[PDB]
Design a protein around this ligand. Structure first.
Ligand SMILES: Nc1ncnc2c1ncn2[C@@H]1O[C@H](CSCC[C@H](N)C(=O)O)[C@@H](O)[C@H]1O
Ligand SMILES: Nc1ncnc2c1ncn2[C@@H]1O[C@H](CSCC[C@H](N)C(=O)O)[C@@H](O)[C@H]1O
Ligand SMILES: [Cl-]
Ligand code: NI
Lengths: 318, 318
C-alpha cells in the first residue's frame, strides 16, 4: 500500500543512517563486494545483526548480494566516500537536532508562540546551537561547501566578477564561494562576514566577525547573500536587505543566490517545510523576493536560473 | 536520484505525522474537500504555514488540490478515521520512543552488549516504559487490535477452537483475540495473561495478572503466543517455551501466531530491524522456531500461513 509505505519509509532513512553513522559505508568503494563476517568482527558487532541489516538494505536497493559477497548498488555508490552530498546530508540532517524538532513541529503550528519547532526543543536558535556544538557546524559547513561547488561553473559564466573591485559575502561561513571565485578571478578585495568563534584563514581572503542585523560596511561594489534569506522570516529578511541598501552606493550590486520556490519542485517544498521547523523561515517565489526587496528600497534588475533548484537575483538601490 | 530520495524520504513521514498529530486529518473524511483558511482559523494555525505544509503533502500525493479546497487522495483516505492501521501506526511509531532510539541503533551494533538501542536511550526495557507512559500503551494496544482483526476470519476457518475447553492467551494484552474468538465460538473458558496496572473487563473473558517468565498455570488445553516471541532474543524466547512445555500436558496445544521471516519480504525485514532496535529480538524462520522449540522440548505438528505477513505454528509436548 502507498500510504503505509510513506509512513514507514522513515525506517529506510534510519537503516541508511546507521550503516553510515557506524562507519561501515566506507568499505564498499568502487563496486567492491564485501564479506560481512570480517566487517562484523572488524567493528566487534554481532554478525547475525549486521547480516539482517544488510538484508534490509538489499531489499530497498541500497546493496546487492552475490556469492562473492555484498556490494553497494551503482545508484547508491555515493555512501562510499565521506565527501558526497548524499553522505554529508546523512551526517548533517539525521540527528536529534532535526528529528526531535520534527516531533515538536505539530505543537509549534497549534501554539502560535513566535518560537520555531527547533527553538521549542533546544531553547536556543539553530545557529546559536552550532556555536555550542563544533561537531555539527563542521558537518553543516561541509554540506554547504558541496552546494556552492555545483553553482561555481555557471555562476562565473552568467555573472561578470571581473568588473568588481571590493566583494563582501554576508553570511558566507567558510568563504568557499569567495575562495572558488578568487581561484578564477584574482586582484580583487574579497571579504567574508559571518558569526565566528574563531576566524578562518585562506590566501587573499579577508574574514570579518560581524552580524548582518547591525549596519553593513560601505566601500564594497558587490554584496552577496547566498542561501541566507531562506533562514529568516519576512520581518528579519527585510532588516538584512535594509542594512544592505544603506551600505550600498548607486553603482553597487547585491547578489541573492537561493533555492527558488516553484509550483512543481517537491525538492524545494520539502526544504521549505524544513526551514519553517528550524528558523520559522521559508523558500520564496520571485514575487516574494520583489516584495521584501521593494520594502528594503531595493529593485530587481536581473533574474536567472543557475540550476534546476538554485537561481540568481541581481538587486540595486532605488 | 534514488539514494538522495531515500535519505530525505523521512521528511514525508514527518509531514504526514504533523498533519495527524495536530488533529487536522480528522476533517478529511468521505473524500470531503476542506478550506485551508478556516482549518487554520479553527486550531489557531497560521494560514501561510498550513498552506505550505498542504503544498508539500499535495506533492507526495497525500492531498489533492481544487478550487473547492483540498482533500485526501483516495490512496491516503485512511488518515481520516482514527481507527485505521495507517493512522494508528503514526500515533504508535512516530514519537521520541522509536526515533531517538533509531539514532542510537548504530551505537547498539558497534557495542556487542545485551542492551538494545531503546534500552540505551530510555535506560529501561520497551514494555517497562509503556507501564509508566499510559498514553502510548493505549495507542500500542489499539494498533495491535487492528493486526488481530485482519487475521480473525482466516484464523477461525483454519483452526478449530470448538475442540478446546480452557484457552489461555499468553501476553494477550486487551483480550481482542479472545474477545473476537468468543463471538463465533461461545461457552468456553477464555483467559488472558499479561502485565496489567489495572485489569480489563470483557464479558466471558478472564484476565490474569502474570509474567510468562514465571511458571505458567497448568490445566489449559490451548496456550496462545501471538506476536510475543518476536519481542524476545533466543535465550528469553526458549525460557517462555520452556515454561509453556512445563504447563502443557500430553493433550495440550501451543499456538504461535507471528510475522514469519521469508526471503523476499520488505515488510517483515523492516519490522525485523525494528525488533532488534527495540528489544534486541528478531522475526524467525520456520527452522529458527523449530530450533528454540526443540531446546524447549516442544515439537511442531502444524504450520500454515494465514495471510501474506502472518503465519500459524501448532506445537505439542513430545
Ligand atoms: N547574524 C548573522 N550575521 C552573519 N552571518 C550570519 C548571521 N546569522 C547566521 N549567519 C550565517 O549565515 C549562513 C547561513 S547558510 C550559509 C551558507 C553559505 N553562504 C554557502 O552557501 O556556502 C551561515 O554561515 C550562518 O552562520
Ligand atoms: N513478562 C511478560 N508476561 C506477560 N506478558 C508480557 C510480558 N512482557 C510483555 N508482555 C506483553 O506481551 C505483549 C506483546 S505484543 C502482543 C499483542 C497481542 N498478543 C495481540 O497481538 O493483539 C504486550 O501485551 C505486553 O504487555
Ligand atoms: Cl512472534
Ligand atoms: Ni492448515
Amino acid at each position: 500500500s502507498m500510504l503505509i509505505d510513506l509512513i514507514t519509509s522513515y525506517r529506510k532513512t534510519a537503516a541508511i543512517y546507521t550503516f553510515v553513522d557506524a562507519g561501515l559505508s566506507i568499505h564498499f568503494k568502487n563496486g567492491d563486494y564485501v564479506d560481512i563476517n570480517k566487517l562484523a568482527s572488524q567493528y566487534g558487532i554481532d554478525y547475525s545483526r549486521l547480516n539482517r541489516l544488510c538484508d534490509f538494505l538489499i531489499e530497498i536497493g541500497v546493496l546487492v548480494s552475490s556469492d562473492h559477497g555484498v556490494a553497494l548498488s551503482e545508484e547508491c555508490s555515493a555512501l562510499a566516500d565521506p565527501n558526497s552530498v548524499e553522505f554529508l546530508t546523512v551526517k548533517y540532517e539525521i540527528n536529534s537536532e532535526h528529528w526531535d524538532s520534527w516531533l515538536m513541529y505539530p505543537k509549534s503550528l497549534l501554539e502560535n508562540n513566535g518560537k520555531s519547532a527547533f527553538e521549542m526543543v533546544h531553547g536556543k536558535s539553530f545557529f546559536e546551537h552550532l556555536d555550542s556544538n563544533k561537531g555539527l557546524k563542521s558537518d553543516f559547513d561541509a554540506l554547504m561547501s558541496k552546494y556552492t561547488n555545483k553553482i561555481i561553473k555557471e555562476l562565473l559564466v552568467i555573472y561578470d566578477f571581473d568588473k568588481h573591485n571590493r566583494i563582501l559575502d554576508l553570511g558566507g561561513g567558510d568563504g568557499e564561494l569567495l575562495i572558488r571565485i578568487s581561484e578564477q578571478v584574482k586582484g580583487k578585495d574579497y571579504t567574508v562576514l559571518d558569526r565566528y568563534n574563531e576566524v578562518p584563514i585562506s590566501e587573499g581572503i579577508n574574514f570579518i566577525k560581524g552580524d548582518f542585523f547591525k549596519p553593513i560596511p560601505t566601500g564594497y561594489d558587490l554584496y552577496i547573500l547566498k542561501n541566507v534569506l531562506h533562514n529568516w522570516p519576512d520581518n528579519d529578511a527585510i532588516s538584512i536587505l535594509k542594512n544592505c541598501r544603506e551600505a550600498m552606493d548607486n553603482n553597487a550590486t547585491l547578489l541573492i543566490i537561493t533555492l527558488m520556490k516553484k509550483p512543481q519542485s517537491l525538492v524545494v517544498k520539502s526544504v521549505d517545510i524544513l526551514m519553517d521547523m528550524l528558523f520559522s523561515a521559508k523558500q520564496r517565489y520571485l514575487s516574494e523576493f520583489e516584495d521584501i526587496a521593494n520594502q528594503a528600497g531595493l529593485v530587481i534588475r536581473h533574474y536567472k536560473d543557475l540550476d534546476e533548484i538554485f537561481s540568481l537575483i541581481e538587486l540595486k538601490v532605488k
